[PDB]
């Protein structure tokens, strides 16, 4: 169910991404709320597109983890932690990660264009 | 910065596509303006999707350049010209190009479907 995995581990919660994805979209004040909700949804979809993740819910990238953002083990993050705790721990680093993801995709797009240009 | 490449060459400006892409989305009269802005954004995303470019900012296609649209050299277009000048020079040919891109993607989708049908 919607948000039922919120208290579950990140691993267990990663298997229910479509439930929340479906639920995100599902006078003047209500029109403003609906237009803003659409704009937010589209901003998140645009941001995924910029990263090359436009059609994926689980999207792997070419940006390495710095370890300064979090030096936890994979078992500590995926088995012993929830998504709310993880989001809180790295709330100060999401703009750095987003910037790196955008730069990495821009480099990937240029590399793909150049590879396609080889006769 | 947003539109900072407007006076730069097409090549130099092609490296800043995410700045404008991010900035495009970022009572009654304002709701109409916001709904129309969303509809325009979605029309451009739908048009890219029709061409098979739904997740790309730089999307290569299978439509050849006719040379009647513009007989300029690549250095004349990418090194000695801006995007505003280029857009003005081919403003009378964008519907032909869009039609060819749509037809080419429709053919590609049928070919992919038939290739996937080979056991």
């Amino acid at each position, epitope marked *: 169910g919607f948000l039922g995995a919120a208290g579950s581990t990140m691993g267990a919660a990663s298997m229910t991404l479509t439930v929340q994805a479906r639920n995100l979209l599902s006078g003047i004040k209500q029109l403003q709320a609906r237009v803003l909700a659409v704009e937010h949804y589209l901003r998140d979809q645009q941001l995924l597109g910029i990263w090359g993740c436009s059609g994926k819910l689980i999207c792997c990238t070419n940006v390495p983890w710095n370890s300064s953002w979090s030096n936890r083990n994979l078992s500590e993050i995926w088995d012993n932690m929830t998504w709310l705790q993880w989001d809180k721990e790295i709330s100060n680093y999401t703009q750095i990660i987003y910037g790196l993801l955008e730069e990495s995709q821009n*480099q990937q797009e*240029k*590399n793909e*264009q*150049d*590879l*396609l*240009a*080889l*006769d | 910065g947003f539109l900072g490449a407007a006076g730069s060459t*097409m*090549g130099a400006a*092609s490296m800043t596509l995410t700045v404008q892409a991010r900035n495009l989305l970022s009572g009654i009269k304002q709701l109409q303006a916001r709904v129309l802005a969303v509809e325009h954004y979605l029309r451009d995303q739908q048009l890219l999707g029709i061409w098979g470019c739904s997740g790309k900012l730089i999307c290569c296609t299978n439509v050849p350049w006719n040379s009647s649209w513009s007989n300029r*050299n*690549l*250095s004349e277009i*990418w090194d000695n010209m801006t995007w505003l000048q280029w857009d003005k020079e081919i403003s009378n040919y964008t519907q032909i190009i869009y039609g060819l891109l749509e037809e080419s993607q429709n053919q590609q989708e049928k070919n992919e479907q038939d290739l996937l049908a080979l056991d």
Partner: antibody
Amino acid sequence: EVQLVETGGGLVQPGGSLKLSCRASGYTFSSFAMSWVRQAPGKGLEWVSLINDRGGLTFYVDSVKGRFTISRDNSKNTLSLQMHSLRDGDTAVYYCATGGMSSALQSSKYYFDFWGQGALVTV
Amino acid sequence: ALTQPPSVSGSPGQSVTISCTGTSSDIGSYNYVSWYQQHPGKAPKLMIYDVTQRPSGVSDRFSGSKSGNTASLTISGLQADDEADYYCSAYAGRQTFYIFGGGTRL
């Protein structure tokens, strides 16, 4: 004019490692793709490796894919090559070449525009 | 590799033909067969790029052509200063970028 000047090692025992560094001037380094081309003392020339103008893409001959790494620093106007496991068949003069590729928005190359003088790598 | 005769010669002032034959995946399908002139002890210089085009600084005595899977270089007005080893280089796709021929001594 355009000049490419090789710096490198000499005799290295079989199975070791050697790195070449090629300086270039007279043109914008970051605007051209670079290649390394090898010529054995008694043979003609063969292509060894190709790097893009930005350095993101590298290509190698199958026989050297696991031994040679090509890299470029566009701020230092320097093209370097590093090779490991130097086999007896790899002794040759290694020439820097400008050209061999272009990044889609430029006219086609698929040829080498400029050549250096060549470093001699022996075993 | 591409195959060309190991030796070419002629009287000064006369034309000579140098040619190399490859396969359909090397010379035939791609119109990118360049030619280089290498003097002993010197690095090769670019003489011809593309099938028929010449770089700036090279005289018009050097002219390229292609037919079928065979590429040729015609050198008219042969000079004593042209006695150099000539090589052809063909683009052969994405897996095999360049294939060079053996040299011919003029």
